[PDB]
């Protein structure tokens, strides 16, 4: 039965060191993802190893080799808009980034 | 003393510190069922369907 | 035999030839009447379109404290057009509608009372052929 | 000009609809627990549908309250009637009947004209809040108030005044001097009485007058029948009865064979709900128009052209009807 | 003898951090306001 | 509505992609896509109807501002109860408040 608890049997792979403050795609015990890592002032309970949100997306992890409280937040998104006069009058444009 | 357990449905109140300081049963009286369906700890005036 | 909407309601007996009618077994909804919980905790329960001589069995009558139809016998039983109401008493006055039930019945928390709504006060104006008012 | 004539016309508008409610699980899965377990995988569509239907249900009571509740006192009519030759017998309540309705309302009530299946599959009809007796009481109060006082009970306390003086004042409101009415009283009264009689005669002999409300009733009936007829379709499965599928195959195939029916019935319910909302919008617009007309043609004299009647407006009276109202100008 | 136990025995359902929300759980619990026999 | 199964073996795309080979993952993804599309369509329809209602209210408010604030109205029960004299506007979040 798939991972519903701390893992016990694992296949052969190579571990890698830990970084922060850059958008990365990681593989935690078979759990794939993408985002950035930082530090949370709120410390987990002694028996808590996962964090979720309303839409059931993983939030925070406690590393399987060393004990920390690290958060996940996907790197920034947003839309793009273009301001132009009539194409029959000129050819210059301006760009706006939302929030 | 000796107690017993049975299957139920519960609504748990979590706070910022992750402590279950309150929890409301779901089959005790009509008010608990109304709270379960509305998903809140206080109910205003009216007539609801359960 | 069948009906205008494809439903079947008549079946013949295959041993002693006779006709029988088929009627759906009862079902309905449950509503709760609560004054604001900031003020009190008493409630009332309404069952739709059923005789309440038949509601110790409509719901299975199993609960620690039943849904304030406390093993649903006792006083406070009223039969209206919308069904039977348990948990309120009948009065012979008229006031303004606080919470509507249906077909002219309104319920208010003073316990809980059920009454018929009043449209207003009564006024009679003197009419003649040589009188006015300014 | 040299002469004049007094005319009376009719106008009909619908107000409210019928209040229905449908239960998802009984309509879709009947009473089979496996179908409910399968349906538990689709989220919260059914709470949405029930919420929409309840929202539609409260609005009809809202509309009726907006239309028929304008005064907060109940006015009586004197037992002695001498209005200078004016005969109001065809619109006043009749005490020699258990219903207390005017003859015109009695005529209107008699002109407007699957049951187990609705009771079978989870379809219910909710009763209204105001009975017809209360609406009749409201109408009689309005009529008595306008007969005895005029436009003065819509802006404060009621004040008494004889009817001929009110008619003279209304004549003064359109540009004709008062002495015209005082020298032609009997002719005007006779024209009024003849017009009322002709109105009743024309109503009681042409059935093509009350079509607007019949249209709404027929539309609702057709929609419900179309909804009920859809429970006998395959949509792709080998049958339409759940019990046969359960008794013929093992669960792995019954899974998909039930999924097809679940999807089809969900689609049908969605279509029904959308059509109901679209109808309710137009009903509400009609109700708002009727409320404005009642405010502006019954409690005062209007200067807008072709709003209350056809010509120069003098006064109007309300009447009750099934799911609607009738105006006489 | 018999003894009442009003609100006791609630345990943490799982091992996931949840922050200031209201949640729905289906699990075995001690019913509220139960008679607890005393020996 | 993003936590549902719709018949698929799970609800997380990466979980499905990390277990199987493309053809079956295609079927599961198809089920998920169909469900989510239906949800989005329902939301859009409801929003359109509510927008129509709000537009009707806004038109009524514009007419009331035009007729009662600028001039004296002879219509019964349009601007207040009784005989109308004058009116004043005030601003509220997402609306307007009138004084008669
Ligand atoms: C205006 O028309 C009316 C009819 O609508 C006329 O009323 C008639 O007047 C004559 C005159 O003596 C009477 O004999 C009749 O009994 C009246 N009624 C009818 C139905 O004919 C009225 O006369 C006309 N106005 C004028 C100035 O002649
Ligand atoms: C008011 O008009 C009605 C309408 O005709 C009159 O009712 C008639 O009254 C007579 C005498 O009482 C009866 O013989 C008729 O059968 C009635 N017909 C109808 C249709 O009601 C009524 O009499 C008039 N009022 C007065 C005071 O004369
Ligand atoms: C506790 O004992 C009383 C004694 O009669 C009984 O009525 C009740 O059902 C029992 N259980 C409770 C209160 O939960």
UniProtKB/Swiss-Prot annotation, chain E:
It comes from the Viruses. Glycans are attached at residue 35. Attaches the virion to the cell membrane by interacting with host receptor, initiating the infection. The major receptor is host ACE2. When S2/S2' has been cleaved, binding to the receptor triggers direct fusion at the cell membrane. When S2/S2' has not been cleaved, binding to the receptor results in internalization of the virus by endocytosis using host TFRC and GRM2 and leading to fusion of the virion membrane with the host endosomal membrane. Alternatively, may use NRP1/NRP2 and integrin as entry receptors. Binds to host ACE2. RBD also interacts with the N-linked glycan on 'Asn-90' of ACE2. Cleavage of S generates a polybasic C-terminal sequence on S1 that binds to host Neuropilin-1 (NRP1) and Neuropilin-2 (NRP2) receptors. Interacts with host integrin alpha-5/beta-1 (ITGA5:ITGB1) and with ACE2 in complex with integrin alpha-5/beta-1 (ITGA5:ITGB1). May interact via cytoplasmic c-terminus with M protein. May interact (via N-terminus) with host bilirubin and biliverdin, thereby preventing antibody binding to the SARS-CoV-2 spike NTD via an allosteric mechanism. This is Spike protein S1. The lineage of its organism: Viruses, Riboviria, Orthornavirae, Pisuviricota, Pisoniviricetes. The gene is S. The chain holds residues 27 to 65 of 1273 of the full protein.
Curated annotation (Swiss-Prot), chain F:
Residues 1-29 form a coiled coil. Disulfide bonds join 68-79. Subunit of the fusion protein that is processed upon entry into the host cell. Mediates fusion of the virion and cellular membranes by functioning as a class I viral fusion protein. Contains a viral fusion peptide that is unmasked after S2 cleavage. This cleavage can occur at the cell membrane by host TMPRSS2 or during endocytosis by host CSTL. In either case, this triggers an extensive and irreversible conformational change that leads to fusion of the viral envelope with the cellular cytoplasmic membrane, releasing viral genomic RNA into the host cell cytoplasm. This is Spike protein S2'. The lineage of its organism: Viruses, Riboviria, Orthornavirae, Pisuviricota, Pisoniviricetes. The gene is S. The chain holds residues 965 to 1064 of 1273 of the full protein.
């Amino acid at each position: 039965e798939l991972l519903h608890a701390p893992a016990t049997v694992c296949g052969p792979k190579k571990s890698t060191n830990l970084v922060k403050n850059k958008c990365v795609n990681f593989n935690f015990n078979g759990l794939t993802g993408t985002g950035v890592l930082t530090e949370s002032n709120k410390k987990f309970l002694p028996f808590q190893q996962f964090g979720r949100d309303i839409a059931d997306t993983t939030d925070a992890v406690r590393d399987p080799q060393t004990l920390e409280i690290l958060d996940i937040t996907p790197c920034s998104f947003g839309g793009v808009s273009v301001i132009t006069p009539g194409t029959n009058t000129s050819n210059q444009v301006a760009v706006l980034y939302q929030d | 003393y000796v107690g017993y357990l049975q299957p139920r449905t519960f609504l748990l109140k979590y706070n910022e510190n992750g402590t279950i300081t309150d929890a409301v049963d779901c089959a005790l009286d009509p008010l608990s069922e109304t709270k379960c369906t509305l998903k809140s700890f206080t109910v205003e005036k009216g007539i609801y369907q359960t | 035999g069948r009906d205008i909407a494809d439903t079947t309601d008549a079946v013949r007996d295959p041993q002693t030839l006779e006709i029988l009618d088929i009627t759906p077994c009862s079902f309905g909804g449950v509503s709760v009447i609560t004054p604001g919980t900031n003020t009190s905790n008493q409630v009332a329960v309404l069952y739709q379109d059923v005789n309440c001589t038949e509601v110790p069995v409509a719901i299975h009558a199993d609960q620690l404290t039943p849904t304030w139809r406390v093993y649903s016998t006792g006083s406070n039983v009223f039969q209206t057009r919308a069904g039977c109401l348990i948990g309120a008493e009948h009065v012979n006055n008229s006031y303004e509608c606080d919470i509507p039930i249906g077909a002219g019945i309104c319920a208010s928390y003073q316990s809980i009372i059920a009454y018929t709504m009043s449209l207003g006060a009564e006024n009679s104006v003197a009419y003649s052929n040589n009188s006015i008012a300014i | 000009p040299t002469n004049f004539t007094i005319s009376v016309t009719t106008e009909i508008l619908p107000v409210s609809m019928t209040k229905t409610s449908v239960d998802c699980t009984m309509y879709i899965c009947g009473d089979s627990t496996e179908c409910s377990n399968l349906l538990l995988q689709y989220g919260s569509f059914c709470t949405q549908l029930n919420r929409a239907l309840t929202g539609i249900a409260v609005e009809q009571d809202k509309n009726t309250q907006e239309v028929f509740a304008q005064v907060k006192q109940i006015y009586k009519t004197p037992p002695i009637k001498d209005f200078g030759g004016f005969n109001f017998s065809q619109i006043l309540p009749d005490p020699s009947k258990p219903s207390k309705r005017s003859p015109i309302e009695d005529l209107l009530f008699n002109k407007v004209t699957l049951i187990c299946a609705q009771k079978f599959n989870g379809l219910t009809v909710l009763p209204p809040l105001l009975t017809d007796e209360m609406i009749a009481q409201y109408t009689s109060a309005l009529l008595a108030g306008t007969i005895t006082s005029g436009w003065t009970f819509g802006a404060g306390p009621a004040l008494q005044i004889p009817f001929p003086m009110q008619m003279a004042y209304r004549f003064n409101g359109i540009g004709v001097t008062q002495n015209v009415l005082y020298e032609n009283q009997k002719l005007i009264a006779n024209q009024f009485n003849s017009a009322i009689g002709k109105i009743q005669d024309s109503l009681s002999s042409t059935p093509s007058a009350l079509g607007k409300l019949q249209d709404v009733v027929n539309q609702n009936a057709q929609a419900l029948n179309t909804l009920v007829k859809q429970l006998s379709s395959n949509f792709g499965a080998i049958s339409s009865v759940l019990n046969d599928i359960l008794s013929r195959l093992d669960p792995p195939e019954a899974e998909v064979q039930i999924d097809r029916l679940i999807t089809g019935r969900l689609q049908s319910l969605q279509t029904y709900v959308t059509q109901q909302l679209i109808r309710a919008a137009e009903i509400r617009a009609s109700a708002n128009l009727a409320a404005t007309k009642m405010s502006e043609c019954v409690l005062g004299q209007s200067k807008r052209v072709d709003f209350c009647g056809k010509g120069y407006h003098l006064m109007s009276f309300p009447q009750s009807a099934p799911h609607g109202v009738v105006f006489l100008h | 003898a018999y003894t009442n136990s009003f609100t006791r025995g609630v345990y943490y359902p799982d091992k996931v951090f949840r922050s200031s929300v209201l949640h729905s759980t289906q699990d075995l619990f001690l019913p509220f306001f139960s008679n607890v026999t005393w020996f």
